[PDB]
Design a protein around this ligand. Structure first.
Ligand SMILES: Nc1ncnc2c1ncn2[C@@H]1O[C@H](COP(=O)(O)OP(=O)(O)OP(O)(O)=S)[C@@H](O)[C@H]1O
Ligand SMILES: Nc1ncnc2c1ncn2[C@@H]1O[C@H](COP(=O)(O)OP(=O)(O)OP(O)(O)=S)[C@@H](O)[C@H]1O
Ligand SMILES: Nc1ncnc2c1ncn2[C@@H]1O[C@H](COP(=O)(O)OP(=O)(O)OP(O)(O)=S)[C@@H](O)[C@H]1O
Ligand SMILES: [Mg+2]
Ligand SMILES: [Mg+2]
Ligand SMILES: [Mg+2]
Ligand SMILES: [Zn+2]
Ligand SMILES: [Zn+2]
Ligand SMILES: [Zn+2]
Ligand SMILES: [Zn+2]
Ligand SMILES: [Zn+2]
Lengths: 376, 670, 263, 71, 566
């Protein structure tokens, strides 16, 4: 008999969680999978191994259906013919390869059946090593992360992340004249994702969280305790740190049935003499916040804050990529050196602090984009 | 036993019987019970068989389409399974629905013995359009397991490709004996004949395809800018491609907010033109089943802008509805509201209930929503009753919220910010299509706003080069492009609603009005109303303002004000069926007011001089006031109210005619 | 560095209605003929196949009159077009024989079962060697005579493994037709098959050349083939005319069954 | 067993679905023009009970009843 | 034997009876003249190629079956009509047979005129009438009509091969010397060609929907219809909706139809040593017109003799009556821009601009401009744009442009690329779309400096130079300019000169003959009269407009007066 193979009957996706460093310390095990590497440290000797990379996510593609096996129907014999796909491109089948058609003189014609075929939710992400991992005088490089199955939408741009996956080679992409032998591209088939900063929307009232929360409540004076611990090595500025804590928490977003909205986020300005450690406060606040962005006033231009229209080649479509006010959406945008900015960024932030959107009407796009940033 | 289609859980017999029972035995009171609305059940409409009378009027009118609400399937007990089968397997369940609709059309005259012939009905191909299939989850939150499911989406149309012929029947001709055959398309593939079908002529490769004899069908591709209800953290908006077929072609225009329900599809794309090699990553699109262009939350589209489009809708039998159907009961309700003595204050109060006071501002917004009358000269001229309003004022005067409300209430406006917009981005531009890799035309903000209101926030921050585009829009309601690929006049009959601050970011009484506004004279004169909305510090005004913004926070979900649905349908009816005209009594008032303002402008720039455009603004405002009260003629009191609104907008009573300055404590009443 | 994608099939729908001239239906009818034929009270062909499996004789002997008795349509298809129908009946024998072999050695306590040979005999009218005409070409003929010479056993190739000279591409050619003479109806491919197959994702202009395959003889399989010369009966020959003869080719279990001089 | 009347001609998509089918008291009410799984469930249904309480569709019957009362 | 088309032959019979039977009554006398035999006789003495058939004449036959057959299946029945016309002209005027002469049937007076966006796929291969504005005209090119081939190995010549759209080679090879069909070689000298033009048309500005951009269509003219359409005019094309292969639909979403070879009756053997031909079915709608007529670009030839020959007796009598009037100049001034009150000097200037001066060339070679360029400057809301609206809605060969919506290429000429190919084409700019007309440019002040430079160059030499890409061209742009400008600072400063009030450069200013500074003065009488005029306009529309002359008689007088060279 020819049965449907097991591969066409899985409803589950299987992933590898790396061993924790503490459990390795208990049991005298030394594993290469547990230790976070940088992109520079991931060499050709790690191919095929389950390894963990630490870094920032810079690019996330849209979720697309990548076909793993293609299903065809034959009207001549009634069989379903499945051809596997393990490459970026494939050639479709025309004549039926089932036993009944293979033996028969007349060959049937195969038609694609997209409901009977197997797809994976596919995303390609770019990971870049942190500034603490870049050596002296070097430019950060990038690594490609392949996300398939359930793990999609677990990576977003601007996330410090430990990604554990299988380091696998791919066919060479580049000029044919520059290759020497069997050159291969590289990627990381993602198996596990650990966020350094957990998202506020991802918070769940689990059992283990409750005793820590109740311990902090029973310790008392949580307002003053959380205020003065924001930047413990910055002396004084108790009320400044209190309003920075209120910046981190924020108020209640209000919606009325008429349709108008009142924002709940708080915007805080620190204007002061030089040497009052306000840049240290900005660094501390949007290092504490899970979705914080630090920005120097002339370091970001008008296109570097609102939006830019550019092409994604993996999904092959012309997409809008936001600036710092998009990367800090549902977070805090740290805008250092506020008084030395241009009028373009001032107008963009001027619209952001009230309507929480940016409207772009240019030669490329006519759109509005959500930016619910709290601005420091 | 019972047969099931492979890959599904769908039985043709079971689904046919269930949907037939649903069509024969549905009442809209079931929808009332399902939506937890018991007190709104009425005897005369809910207890009538809904789809029976809808299929009857479908028979009388020659309509071949049934618009089916999927929530109604959940209202009925027996079709609650079928609802899921409509969402999971639209491709065959829709065909089952079409077949049983045809059966029901036969049955309604077979059983009841009507005089209609069966041949015309059974020749017709009835098809169903399901809509309201569920929650509007985003495109980017969908998964490959959602392929070939019914999905509902919000969006704005950016552009549409021309009519594309997709080939349904193929016509092959023999070269030597001129014998022809016609072959049907089968799942996108046409079998070309290797040998001639004739017994006498069997020559190989003698069949050639004649491209003009073979039959085609309409296919159009529309680029839709999606506006999800929920947007994840840092999600930047995208454009989808949606394919409409047959009747639905050219039913969506560029710049309209629509409700697309369709099928989630995925196809592989060829990597090269010469090769048949396909890409493993698939391209997703929506195969559109039904388009809803009407929301009860917002106004209907202006009928004066789509007259030939409505005629083409009638010709093509696309029969997608553009305006709300007004019944008799709600029409009588519209008249009894229109006869109320305080109708003007009632309608102005019902504009923005969350915005406190600004009564004259709301009255002007109401009159801009109504609009003046549109007059088409037989010689060829055209006058458009579009009211332009500038709101200049101190910060935090709820004016940006007024722009947000107007943007939500208008059918096809565009919200823009000062200097976040460019001159090219307001009119038209050349873009690169991702699909065809071709240079395509795409409409700017002002052209996309035709038939609606263009809201421009921070009008003072806009650069003068960008600001120069608006002149032709406010004077002729057109934009005349002479660029590299475009030499044409585009209709932009959009009402400009702008917001601005003074130079010092706060109004200065020591400075005059014109210096405070900081707009050039050929620009400011095009505005029908200029509102100086100032923040005066009072006891009672601050107390009531604080109470108004503070009662909003009493509960999580917060006189007499009309509901937004009734307000929208009232304004839609008044715009569609009421065209007031000027009488001689109104003419005398208009002329006397214009000469009075010109005489007042004689005194010695520092003050806003009277303008011919101010006479035209008075005419348009009086026409909008007459259109409000459902009068077909403009009386004298309409002109007096227009003059009062114009004078109170700029606060002419407060200002000194000589110096041009405005006092605060003396004349102004908060 | 990915693997070759594999293609598999699974029967779901009924498909188009079967036709009698289809190869699958001919194979099924032949299989039912083998399994269901009774001479007096016994399945003679089923028992013969089992006994031949026990003695490692991978062939079946079938009488042609039994095919007349069972189904005339497959009989006339076999008679008119033997080179298309004989491999189908051999495939039917092999499908029955694998089923018999698996159920035999696992109950009466790796194994490769080759394609079975069709030997078919009949008692129909024997046309003489002088009345062979062009109407008998590619037809099954019954004809009598005497045997003059039997040739030595030549070795024909059934299963042969080939390897490319420099490309190192490994391929296998299976042959089930050895009964042709003076010509290679199956030959090694003219060019390397690694390019057209595209089995490797990397796909490492490189051409391997004309006829680049060599036969790995240690992993190839062979059968025996013999040439016989059949003369007409010298008792019935015209006085002034030389007797006429034919060359015959036999293979597999038909070889070494006769000696020269037998009738 | 009256059954419900149906259209003469079937659709091409409907005929295409016949090739895709595999395997996994009752009657028809002409008053409500629906099939029912059981009669006693069709008796307790909003359309049948709403049809029963209405008397304007048995008017001819009513006239006949009146005539047959005074024969 | 070939199979015949019974309905096609009866359409041929009905058409050849129509060509000899149809007749109308004479207007002047009442005689019965058969107009199509007269048309054939007219073609006989001038050796014409095209026969013009009115569609209303064809609709009168039978109950309308023949006209409906021609309308729905024009592509199928066109060769049958051609051979029917061939038979009729053979019976009547055989001299047209010899020169074989190709004939073209042009249909006109179709009952309905379709928009560009109303074109649907159900009308492919059907007779149609559309309208549009011509933007690009290609040059006349030969099209392979009757190809003559020579076989590669038999090497005998064969001629008169049918050519239908895509290039085809015969597979008959009637000589019995060789045995293959596919291999042939074209003889371009011996083969026959027809004229061919691809003119691109755009949706008319009144027909564009509310938010959408105009969409274009490539209509192809053949034979005598070639070069009957000019860049920038409104033409009504009657023809057939055809379909043309398009390759750019590969990336489009949806199932693209494809064609593969059916293999069911082909015997095969697995001898060994599996390729098939599959080809895409992707297309775009095009048009093939047999009749081109140019309706006026207005809402409603230099020699005078040809103009007065065109007019009939009644309108030439009306023109003579207009000429004879002694107060004609005042009536001409009062008839210009009736919606505008006052500003008689601007109306005089507009009239003189629409008339213009003579063009003179000296013996040295320099050209003296006869075109009058007028700039209207003044205070806001002085009806300075109403004049431009009147000139564009009235004057022939007039275009309207805004200052900021302008461009250097859009006003003069553009070098453009189609389908990302190696071919570069020329878009005619606004100055050439108004050639021997008026280019009306509102907000000349808001125009940037580069476009002002590119337009005063075309005011200097009255020509346009192109050197972009591989295209070097000299283009004719002799055009009067009606500019509207606002002063710097908004209002007009009386204390400053005209140069100080305007940012328009000195080369721009030096070539404007008239500078009309129209100003607002506040006095009760004229403000009251102007307000009364405007409210009467709003009340009465066309009833409030009572000019001395209507637009059509004004245009006839202007076109008559432009023939004079004072
Ligand atoms: N209150 C403070 N407590 C501790 N360290 C401080 C304090 N104020 C200043 N410093 C130190 O002085 C330096 C201040 O650096 P910054 O953060 O750049 O201050 P600043 O206010 O941002 O200066 P700018 O850029 O001119 S506004 C750091 O080295 C701080 O550690
Ligand atoms: N009179 C009012 N009625 C209701 N809400 C008000 C009023 N005045 C201020 N607000 C609210 O106060 C906030 C101020 O934002 P906006 O008034 O929208 O800003 P703005 O008036 O446009 O002035 P800008 O942004 O500086 S140009 C909003 O949440 C308003 O809803
Ligand atoms: N003198 C006038 N005679 C007739 N109509 C006038 C006059 N002045 C103004 N109008 C009318 O008032 C309106 C003025 O519109 P426009 O002609 O666009 O103003 P404008 O003269 O172009 O000034 P700018 O430069 O555009 S601000 C139009 O409806 C005119 O018909
Ligand atoms: Mg600092
Ligand atoms: Mg604001
Ligand atoms: Mg103007
Ligand atoms: Zn098959
Ligand atoms: Zn033929
Ligand atoms: Zn090789
Ligand atoms: Zn019932
Ligand atoms: Zn030849």
């Amino acid at each position: 008999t020819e049965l449907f193979p097991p591969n066409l009957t899985r409803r589950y996706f299987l992933y590898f969680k790396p061993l924790s460093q503490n459990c390795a310390r208990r049991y005298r095990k030394k594993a290469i999978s547990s230790k976070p590497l940088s992109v520079r440290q991931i060499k050709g000797d790690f191919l095929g191994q389950l390894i963990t990379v630490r870094g920032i996510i810079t690019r996330v593609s849209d979720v697309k259906p990548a076909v793993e096996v293609i299903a065809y129907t034959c009207d001549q014999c009634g069989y379903e013919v499945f051809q596997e796909v393990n490459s970026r491109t494939f050639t479709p089948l025309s004549e039926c390869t089932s036993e009944e058609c293979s033996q028969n003189q007349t060959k049937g014609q195969l038609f694609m059946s997209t409901r009977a075929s197997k797809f994976s939710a596919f995303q390609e992400c770019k990971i870049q090593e942190l500034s603490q991992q870049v050596p002296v005088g070097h430019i950060p490089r990038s690594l490609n992360i392949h996300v398939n199955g359930t793990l999609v939408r677990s990576l977003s741009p601007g996330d410090i992340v430990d990604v554990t996956g299988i380091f696998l080679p791919a066919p060479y992409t580049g000029f044919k004249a520059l290759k020497a032998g069997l050159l291969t591209e590289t990627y990381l088939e993602a198996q596990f994702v650990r966020q350094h900063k957990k998202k506020f929307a991802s918070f769940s009232l689990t059992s283990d969280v409750e005793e820590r929360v109740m311990e902090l409540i029973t310790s008392g004076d949580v307002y003053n305790r959380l205020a003065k611990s924001i930047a413990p090595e910055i002396y004084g500025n108790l009320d400044v740190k209190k309003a920075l804590l209120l910046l981190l928490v924020g108020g209640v977003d209000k919606r009325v049935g008429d349709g108008m909205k009142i924002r709940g986020d708080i915007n805080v300005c620190l204007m002061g003499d030089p040497g009052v450690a306000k840049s240290q406060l900005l660094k501390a606040i949007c290092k504490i916040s899970p979705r914080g962005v630090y920005t120097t006033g002339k370091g970001s231009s008008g296109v570097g804050l609102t939006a830019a229209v550019m092409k994604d080649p993996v999904t092959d479509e012309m997409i809008l990529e936001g600036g710092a006010l998009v990367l800090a959406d549902n977070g805090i945008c740290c805008i250092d050196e506020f008084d030395k900015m241009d009028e373009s960024d001032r107008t963009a932030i001027h619209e952001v602090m009230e309507q929480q959107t940016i409207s772009i009407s240019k030669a490329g796009i006519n759109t509005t984009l959500n930016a619910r940033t709290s601005i420091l | 036993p019972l047969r099931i289609i492979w890959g599904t859980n769908v039985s043709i017999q079971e689904c046919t019987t269930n949907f037939r029972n649903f069509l024969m035995s549905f009442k809209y009171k079931f929808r009332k019970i399902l939506d937890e609305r018991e007190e709104f059940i009425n005897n005369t409409t809910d207890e009538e068989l809904y789809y029976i009378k809808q299929l009857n009027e479908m028979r009388e009118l020659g309509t071949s389409n049934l618009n089916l609400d999927a929530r109604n399937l959940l209202a009925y007990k027996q079709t609650e399974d079928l609802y899921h089968q409509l969402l999971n397997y639209p491709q065959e369940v829709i065909s089952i629905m079409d077949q049983t609709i045809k059966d029901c059309m036969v049955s309604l005259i077979v059983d009841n013995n009507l005089d209609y012939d069966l041949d015309e009905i059974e020749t017709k191909f009835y098809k169903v359009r399901p809509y309201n299939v569920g929650s509007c989850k985003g495109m980017r939150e969908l998964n490959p397991n959602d392929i070939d499911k019914l999905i509902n989406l919000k969006g704005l149309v950016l552009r549409s490709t021309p009519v594309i012929p997709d080939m349904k029947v193929a016509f092959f001709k023999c070269n030597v004996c001129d014998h022809t055959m016609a072959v049907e398309i089968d799942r996108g593939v046409i079998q070309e004949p290797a040998r001639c079908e004739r017994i006498d002529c069997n020559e190989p490769n003698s069949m050639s395809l004649i491209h003009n004899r073979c039959s085609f069908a309409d296919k159009q591709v529309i680029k839709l800018q999606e506006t999800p209800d929920f947007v994840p953290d840092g999600q930047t908006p995208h454009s989808i491609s949606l394919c409409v077929y047959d009747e639905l072609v050219d039913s969506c225009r560029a710049g309209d907010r629509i409700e697309v329900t369709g099928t989630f599809r995925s196809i592989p794309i060829r990597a090269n033109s010469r090769q048949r090699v396909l890409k493993s990553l698939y391209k997703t699109y929506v195969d559109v089943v039904h388009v809803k262009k009407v929301s009860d939350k917002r106004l209907d589209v202006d009928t004066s802008t789509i007259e030939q489009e409505l005629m083409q809708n009638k010709v093509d039998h696309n029969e997608v509805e553009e305006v709300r159907q007004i019944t008799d009961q709600d029409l009588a309700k519209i008249r009894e509201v229109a006869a109320r003595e305080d109708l003007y204050s009632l309608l102005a109060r019902s504009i923005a209930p969350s915005i406190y006071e600004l009564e004259d501002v709301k009255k002007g917004i109401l009159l801009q929503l109504f609009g003046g009358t549109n007059k088409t000269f037989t010689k060829g001229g055209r006058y458009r009753g579009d009211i332009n309003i500038l709101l200049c004022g101190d910060p935090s005067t709820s004016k940006s919220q007024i722009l947000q409300y107007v943007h939500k209430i208008t059918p096809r406006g565009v919200y823009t910010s000062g200097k976040g917009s460019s001159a090219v981005g307001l009119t038209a531009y050349i873009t690169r299509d991702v699909d065809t890799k071709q240079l395509v035309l795409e409409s700017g903000a002002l052209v996309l706003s035709d038939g609606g209101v263009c809201c421009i926030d921070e009008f003072d921050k806009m650069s003068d080069s960008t600001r120069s585009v608006l002149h032709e829009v406010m004077e002729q309601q057109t934009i005349s492009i002479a660029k590299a690929g475009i030499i044409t006049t585009l209709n932009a009959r959009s009402s400009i609603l702008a917001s601005a601050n003074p130079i010092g970011s706060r109004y200065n009484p020591n400075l005059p009005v014109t210096e405070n506004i900081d707009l050039p004279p050929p620009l400011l004169s095009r505005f029908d109303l200029v509102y100086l909305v100032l923040d005066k510090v009072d006891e009672k005004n601050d107390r009531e303002l604080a109470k108004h913004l503070t009662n909003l926070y009493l509960e999580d979900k917060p006189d007499d004000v009309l509901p937004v649905e009734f307000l929208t349908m009232y304004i839609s009816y008044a715009k569609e069926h009421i065209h007031p005209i000027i009488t001689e009594a109104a003419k005398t008032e208009l002329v006397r007011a214009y000469v009075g303002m010109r005489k007042m402008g004689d005194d010695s720039e520092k003050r806003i001089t009277a303008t011919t455009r101010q006479l035209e603004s008075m005419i348009r405002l009086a026409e909008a006031h007459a259109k409000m009260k459902l009068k077909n003629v403009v009386e004298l009191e309409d002109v007096q109210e227009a003059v009062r609104l114009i004078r109170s907008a700029i606060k002419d009573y407060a200002t000194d005619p000589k110096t041009g300055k405005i006092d605060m404590n003396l004349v102004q009443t908060g | 560095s990915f693997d070759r994608p594999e293609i598999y099939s699974a029967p779901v729908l009924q498909g188009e209605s079967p036709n009698d001239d289809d190869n699958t239906e001919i194979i099924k009818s032949f299989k039912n003929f083998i399994l269901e034929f009774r001479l007096d009270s016994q399945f003679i062909y089923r028992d013969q196949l089992r006994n031949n499996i026990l003695v490692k004789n991978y062939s079946l002997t079938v009488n042609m009159e039994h095919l007349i008795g069972y189904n005339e349509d497959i009989y006339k298809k076999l008679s008119d077009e033997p080179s298309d129908i004989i491999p189908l009946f051999e495939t039917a024998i092999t499908q029955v024989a694998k089923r018999i072999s698996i159920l035999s050695r696992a109950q009466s306590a790796l194994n490769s079962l080759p394609t079975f040979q069709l030997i078919l005999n009949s008692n129909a009218n024997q046309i003489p060697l002088r009345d062979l005409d062009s109407e008998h070409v590619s037809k099954i003929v019954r004809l009598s005579g005497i045997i003059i010479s039997t040739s030595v056993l030549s070795s024909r190739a059934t299963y042969l493994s080939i390897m490319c000279r420099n490309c190192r591409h490994t391929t296998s050619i299976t042959i089930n037709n050895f009964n042709s003479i003076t010509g290679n109806t199956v030959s090694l491919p003219r060019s390397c098959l690694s390019t057209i197959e595209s089995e490797s994702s990397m796909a490492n202009k490189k051409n391997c050349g004309p006829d680049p395959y060599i036969i790995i003889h240690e992993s190839s399989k062979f059968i025996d083939q013999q040439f016989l010369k059949l003369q007409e009966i010298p008792e019935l020959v015209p006085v002034g005319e030389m007797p006429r003869n034919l060359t015959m080719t036999c293979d597999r279990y038909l070889t070494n069954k006769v000696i020269p001089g037998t009738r | 067993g009256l059954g419900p009347t149906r259209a003469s001609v079937m659709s091409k998509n409907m005929k295409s679905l016949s090739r895709l089918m595999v395997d996994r008291n009752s009657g028809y009410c002409e008053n409500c023009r629906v099939k029912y799984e059981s009669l006693e469930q069709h008796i307790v249904s909003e359309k049948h009970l709403s049809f029963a309480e209405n008397d304007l569709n048995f008017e001819a019957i009513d006239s006949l009843i009146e005539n047959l009362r005074f024969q | 034997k070939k199979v015949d088309d019974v309905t096609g032959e009866k359409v041929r019979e009905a058409f050849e009876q129509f060509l000899e039977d149809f007749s109308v009554q004479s207007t002047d006398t009442g005689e019965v003249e058969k107009v199509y035999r007269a048309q054939i006789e007219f073609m006989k003495i001038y050796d014409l190629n095209t026969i013009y058939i009115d569609y209303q004449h064809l609709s009168m036959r039978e109950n309308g079956a023949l006209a409906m057959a021609i309308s729905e299946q024009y592509y199928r029945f066109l060769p049958f009509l051609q051979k029917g016309l061939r038979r009729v002209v053979r019976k009547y005027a055989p001299e047209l047979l010899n020169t074989e002469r190709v004939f073209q049937i042009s249909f006109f007076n179709l009952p309905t005129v379709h928009r560009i966006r109303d074109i649907r796929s159900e009308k492919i291969g059907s007779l149609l009438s559309i309208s549009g504005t011509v933007t690009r005209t290609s040059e006349v090119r030969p099209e392979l009509y009757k190809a003559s081939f020579t076989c590669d190995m038999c090497r005998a010549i064969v001629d008169n091969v049918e050519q239908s759209f895509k290039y085809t080679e015969p597979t008959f090879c009637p000589n019995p010397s060789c045995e293959n069909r596919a291999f042939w070689t074209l003889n371009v000298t011996r083969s026959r060609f027809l004229d061919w033009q691809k003119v691109r048309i755009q949706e008319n500005a009144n027909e564009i929907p509310t938010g959408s951009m105009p969409r274009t269509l490539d209509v192809i003219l053949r034979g005598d219809s070639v070069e009957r359409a000019k860049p920038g005019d409104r033409c009504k094309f009657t023809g057939v909706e055809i379909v043309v292969p398009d390759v750019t639909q590969l990336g489009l979403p949806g199932v693209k139809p494809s064609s593969t070879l059916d293999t069911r009756g082909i015997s095969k053997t697995t001898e060994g040593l599996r390729s098939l031909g599959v080809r895409d079915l992707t297309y775009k709608i095009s048009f093939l017109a047999c009749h081109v007529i140019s309706i006026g670009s207005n809402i409603g030839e230099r020699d005078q003799e040809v103009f007065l020959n065109s007019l009939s007796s009644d309108e030439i009598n009306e023109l003579k009556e207009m000429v004879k009037d002694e107060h004609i100049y005042d009536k001409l001034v009062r008839s210009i821009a009736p919606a505008v009150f006052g500003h008689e000097a601007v109306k005089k200037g507009i009239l003189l601009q629409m008339l213009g001066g003579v063009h003179k060339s000296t013996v040295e070679g320099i050209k003296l401009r006869g075109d009058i360029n007028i700039c209207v400057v003044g205070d806001p809301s002085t009806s300075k744009s109403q004049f431009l609206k009147y000139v564009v809605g009235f004057a022939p060969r007039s275009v309207y442009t805004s200052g900021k919506a302008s461009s250097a290429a859009g006003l003069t000429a553009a070098v453009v690329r189609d389908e990302e190919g190696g071919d570069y084409t020329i878009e005619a700019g606004a100055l050439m779309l108004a050639d021997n007309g008026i280019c009306c440019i509102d907000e000349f002040d808001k125009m940037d400096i580069s476009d002002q430079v590119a337009i005063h160059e075309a005011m200097e030499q009255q020509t346009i130079s192109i050197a972009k890409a591989g295209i070097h061209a000299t283009l004719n742009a002799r055009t009067s300019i009606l500019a509207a400008a606002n002063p710097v600072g908004g209002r007009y400063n009386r204390k400053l000169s005209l140069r100080g009030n305007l940012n328009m450069t000195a080369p721009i200013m030096s070539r404007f003959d008239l500078f009309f500074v129209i100003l607002d003065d506040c006095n009760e009488k004229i403000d009251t009269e102007l307000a009364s005029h405007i409210v009467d306009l709003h009340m009465k529309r066309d009833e409030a407009i009572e000019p001395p002359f209507s637009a059509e008689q004004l245009r006839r007088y202007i076109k008559y007066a432009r023939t004079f060279k004072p």
